[PDB]
């Protein structure tokens, strides 16, 4: 995924 959360 590109970012967390």
């Amino acid at each position: 995924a590109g970012x967390a959360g």
Partner: antibody
Amino acid sequence: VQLVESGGGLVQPGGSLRLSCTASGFSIDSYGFSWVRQAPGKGLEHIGYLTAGGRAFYASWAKSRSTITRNTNENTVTLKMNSLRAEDTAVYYCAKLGSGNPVAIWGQGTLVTVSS
Amino acid sequence: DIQMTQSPSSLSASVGDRVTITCRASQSVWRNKNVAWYQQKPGKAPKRLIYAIASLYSGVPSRFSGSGSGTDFTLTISSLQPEDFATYYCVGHYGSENDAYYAFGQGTKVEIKR
């Protein structure tokens, strides 16, 4: 592609700041957006992150007083901070930080001065 | 929560010198990928130079480059120029599928010896 900021200036201690960035040329829910601030002469401080999935996370120092939201209809993201003290005087920025992606976009920043 | 420590906190170097700034995270960054480097000149907004540890933004000169793995990272200015006077910040992304955090190093001021 722009991210013009609004809502800064002179604020009284004990009051609240409300800051908004209006995305010009794209949709605000496309990317996650951070709020960052820099007190005069000091370094950069991360306030919180609103992930493109919509969940807001805050640094521990800011969790008590801060709420970050977005209005997809408005094409804006918003920082709300209350119980302001002199230590909150800073240039405030909204930005997709681009720690890992080729896209990075920053507002021009607005100074918030907390003073009576 | 998370911390990031840059070293040194300030430095002076000559035009043409190779300059190295080390960043160091308190945890592993997201995917061991999400570290960027920013440059801030006086009275200007911060400007991103490097993203994903080593990718160079197309608007930035190729004398900037990054490297590092896991929790320790490096910015290299290969041939220092007068216009590189600035404060340089690393920024890191952190968290899980249920956590999202960003942290900045304290900044490294680069001064030009002349």
